[PDB]
Amino acid sequence: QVTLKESGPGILQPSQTLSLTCSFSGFSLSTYGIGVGWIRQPSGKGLEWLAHIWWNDNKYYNIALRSRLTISKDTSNNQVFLKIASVDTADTATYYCARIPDDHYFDYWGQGTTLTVSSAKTTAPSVYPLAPVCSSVTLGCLVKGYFPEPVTLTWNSGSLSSGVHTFPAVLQSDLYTLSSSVTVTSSTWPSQSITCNVAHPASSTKVDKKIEPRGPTIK
Amino acid sequence: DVLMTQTPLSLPVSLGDQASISCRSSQSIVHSNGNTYLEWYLQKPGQSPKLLIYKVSNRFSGVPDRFSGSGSGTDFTLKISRVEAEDLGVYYCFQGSHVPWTFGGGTKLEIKRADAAPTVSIFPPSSEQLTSGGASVVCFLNNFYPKDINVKWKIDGSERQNGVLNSWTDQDSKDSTYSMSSTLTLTKDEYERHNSYTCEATHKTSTSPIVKSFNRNEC
């Protein structure tokens, strides 16, 4: 059975208070030796332990953050709550809650909610087609200035899959950016239309971008 | 505040090969109760970490005969003898002995293949982007091995350091190669001054760099 699900705000403004709930089944915190803890993983980096509470209500917090951290259990309804105060862009991470089976360590981790701390407002992506300079042909698609993450990119509405390279998003300024290269035989393109499809669930923005060959223009 | 040090950062292994991950702590990790709390977690891409070895040598649920944990006091080691598809990902040595509980930097188990040189593709700023006011210059370095690469941006011969944003893909599911995008972001005013735009790339496959360039005249 053993399941750990963690509920979070997912996205919030700097200096607000982050409040998250690790709901669980398959074990009770009313049982002996049992404990639940919190770990955070920043956007493709190593893990970091935050805090944990034991069955007897003994709380252990990271000496690094301490003051902002408050952990409390709710034995009756199988829930644990971690609350971090006055958050900043430094706290943009994925937060996991994990069970301590007696001995000092974690055994079953949960799915892990993803939190993003930013001042930025909801913004639809600007899809820019990348046709080559004025055999095989390489085409691109630059998705720029969107908020928040994530964006979903396909080529020819999923028909094109071979030689596709979507790159991870990079935080441009207050907003994200990403690219995806596509390589086809010189006989496939221009001759047959290649369309880059982007979908931004947050801003409910679905865009098709026909990448046509680079034409000339003098000012 | 125990410093956990993993060796190496990236592990290139063939399939069925014998693999050994090295962990080394800043101090003795023997907990008051006599037990040494060294754990090994395997985090697969787009998933929460999962426990393999707990208490230096003991195997967790559904952790095969192939995985073996050793060491004592300072140096510890995980051995995976006949590497399979399921066995790839990021490994972290963890300690439950002293509070604050700390994780290792992580070791990436990746598959080694033949040496391959990148396919550089330079993309000038699109007509769609220039009208809006911006001027991003994309460069894709596709399908190479090993993962370590280096890109230099040369505007009119002069090297640029500031204003470059790079992203790297994971290892290819099919061809087991890496790809990298490199976006030199510029204002239209800056871009509208200069002519030659070069995306110079260096990789172990060849002694001399792989130059890819365009001129603002034609496009």
Residue numbers in the entry:
A (entry chain A): 1 to 134, 140 to 224
B (entry chain B): 1 to 219
From the paper:
ErbB4 (HER4) is a member of the ErbB subfamily of receptor tyrosine kinases (RTK) that also includes EGFR (also known as ErbB1 or HER1), ErbB2 (c-Neu, HER2) and ErbB3 (HER3). Similar to other RTKs, ligand interaction with ErbB4 promotes receptor dimerization, kinase activation, and initiation of phosphorylation-dependent signaling cascades, such as the mitogen-activated protein kinase (MAPK) and phosphoinositide 3-kinase (PI3-K)/Akt pathways. In addition to promoting these indirect signaling cascades, ErbB4 has been demonstrated to relay signals from the cell surface by releasing a soluble intracellular domain (ICD) fragment, in a process called regulated intramembrane proteolysis (RIP). RIP involves shedding of the ErbB4 extracellular domain via the activity of tumor necrosis factor-alpha converting enzyme (TACE/ADAM17) generating a substrate for a secondary cleavage at the plasma membrane by γ-secretase activity.
